[PDB]
Design a protein around this ligand. Structure first.
Ligand code: ADP
Ligand code: ADP
Ligand code: MG
Ligand code: MG
Lengths: 367, 367
């Protein structure tokens, strides 16, 4: 039989059967209602378009992201996410395969029960396991020690794990990135005349957040060469034909990740949450959290990541401490390659959630 | 029995049975009373002459177009238009056929109501639907996206539709074309000494507006070769036997369509109403409003369009944006071939206004 690794990604939900190297389906999670008068006869339309189709029919719909600060807004849209994914993307019956689901490292209750229960009664899954996204990135990297940085649009997390136990008193949740980085980029993109106010227009901002934005080596010195008239500015092209040229704001927006003063929020940067979680761990283990710092999520692919984070930590940490930050190719699919490695392993398969146990004990013993 | 497609044109009402060729009866809406005393007695002639006998017996009558600025002058003449077409052209019973009527995109309330209500109570049709004249040209052209140009004597319109929704905030109505081009032609025909002024006499001007006039490619450069002593004159023959030679004024009159300062009205050319409506639409859709510009109506049958319109848009439009214009053969009957395609389709017959529903709720829910 076949098993399915399905990641409830922040962006960028990822789905694909076990092995060999990639998700079969990746999509930007948006659901979109029709916001204008439909005058055509027929009409040949869907009641609501999900992604990909909601990313090829922008501006005639009203985009609704179904996950907001790590909570899924309603299961009415969520069941349609699931159904769409299984039937017209993966092309599989849920009863066919035991599944693998992902969750958040720090989340409220009740969100793992309600998921497990609704998916068991609605889609009639035969067995299930639900993993937090951070744990899976250890399997992908081949590590069993380290602080895990799982960063997606828009909840990041900072989890310390040591061979092979979790440190409860050192776990930090930042709501700092990344949809708020999108929202900030749109707010400092107003300075260059072309505005992108609406929900639909925000997706275009995300494409300029991917490609053109970059993290610097040091803020003060990038501000210095920005003052120079020699152009380091980059020209983006807009679907109507227009060319938008951004320069200084290009490195100002991502710098927010190490300087939350741009949002003005009271929370501290990835720099300091790394230090403050390490300096709340036991003395012996602090040695091996340094050099096993493991990054993940699509948002960590910027040029100055990890060597900004490195240079800043090496300055605050004691003299001659060995610090190297683990940055593998294609981090956006790291989590999925984790799940892929995990569910194939012998043998405590007999620690999963299964229909027979669910029949007697329901959605209890899930945390 | 079989549905009847009758389009309440701007000009130029068109009427014809369900498909597939062209309307059975077309006439330019004129009613005309006899303006001189009767002396032969009896006398075998009507109280007011309808077409086509009112276009042969010109000069003994006072011609009155009943559709003025898109408003119908009174239902006394309108009911007579209807009665004359159904009885004395088509030879059809209104009680027998579900009918299909058209109206304008932006026009005053309650002129679609009062029309629908009078046609149900006077002619006792069994079912009816009222379509805006522009939407039907999409079905005829075989597309479902684009800005629709329905241009007739005396009201043109600019409606943007995107697969298959309509933008309420982007609809532009010009009262500029075509009867004011007729009036301008009549004022510059005085320039060659022919004093043409009367209501009847205006019709002959309309025929010279069709055949002899031509749209240029660049005004200043068409004026340049006009400035050479060599002829630009074309010779028209007039019913009394006279030969009229127009040349210079020949390209001056149609140019009014892109140069409305010739009339002196504050409104801007089809060029600029296209651009200003497209750049009032949301960013993503703007790409496909370009290159799916769809022309229609008899007044667009000048050979110098669409490449005047093309060259003008290409001058204002951003670089690298493709511009193509959808312009079929026989554009005057585009709308009618639309109506034929529409009313023949299943299953939207149960979205028509039917006699039972009209009896139940009167002239409500028409829009
Ligand atoms: N090259 C890139 N540079 C910066 N951000 C990127 C890049 N590619 C993708 N992203 C970001 O990755 C985000 C998706 O995060 P995701 O990987 O889904 O997080 P997670 O798996 O933890 O939920 C997107 O919202 C997008 O902005
Ligand atoms: N070859 C032509 N060149 C220019 N004008 C034309 C030509 N053929 C017809 N027309 C014009 O078309 C007008 C009718 O427009 P029409 O298409 O009937 O308006 P509508 O679309 O709103 O019903 C007439 O008044 C006539 O002057
Ligand atoms: Mg994550
Ligand atoms: Mg028309």
């Amino acid at each position: 039989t076949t098993a399915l690794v399905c990641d409830n990604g922040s962006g960028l939900v990822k789905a694909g059967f076990a092995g060999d190297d990639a998700p079969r389906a990746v999509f930007p999670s948006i659901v979109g209602r029709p916001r204008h008068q439909g005058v055509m006869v027929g009409m040949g339309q869907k009641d609501s378009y999900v992604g990909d189709e909601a990313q090829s029919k922008r501006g005639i719909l009203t985009l609704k992201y179904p996950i907001e600060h790590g909570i899924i807004t309603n299961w009415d849209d969520m069941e349609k996410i699931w159904h769409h994914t299984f039937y017209n993307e993966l092309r599989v019956a849920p009863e066919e395969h035991p599944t693998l689901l992902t969750e958040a490292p720090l989340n409220p209750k009740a969100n793992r029960e309600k998921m497990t229960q609704i998916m068991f009664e609605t889609f009639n899954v035969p067995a299930m396991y639900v993993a937090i996204q951070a744990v899976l990135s250890l399997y992908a990297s081949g590590r069993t020690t380290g602080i895990v940085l799982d960063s997606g649009d828009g909840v990041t997390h900072n989890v310390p794990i040591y061979e092979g136990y979790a440190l409860p008193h050192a776990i930090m949740r930042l709501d700092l990135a990344g949809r708020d980085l999108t929202d900030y980029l749109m707010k400092i993109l107003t300075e260059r005349g072309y505005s992108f106010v609406t929900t639909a227009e925000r997706e275009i901002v995300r494409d300029i957040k991917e490609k053109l934005c970059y993290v610097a080596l040091d803020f003060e010195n990038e501000m210095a060469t920005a003052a120079s008239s020699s152009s380091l500015e980059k020209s983006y092209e807009l679907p109507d034909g227009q060319v938008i040229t951004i320069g200084n704001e290009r490195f100002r927006c991502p710098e927010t990740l190490f300087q939350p003063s741009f949002i003005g929020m009271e929370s501290a940067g990835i720099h300091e949450t790394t230090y403050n979680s390490i300096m709340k761990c036991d003395i012996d283990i602090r040695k091996d959290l340094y050099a096993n710092n493991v990054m993940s999520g699509g948002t960590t692919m910027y040029p100055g990541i990890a060597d900004r984070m490195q240079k800043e930590i090496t300055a605050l940490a004691p003299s001659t401490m060995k610090i190297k930050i683990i940055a593998p190719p294609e981090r956006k699919y790291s989590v999925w390659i984790g799940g892929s490695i995990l569910a194939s392993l012998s043998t405590f398969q007999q620690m999963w959630i299964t229909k027979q146990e669910y029949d007697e004990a329901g959605p209890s013993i899930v945390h």
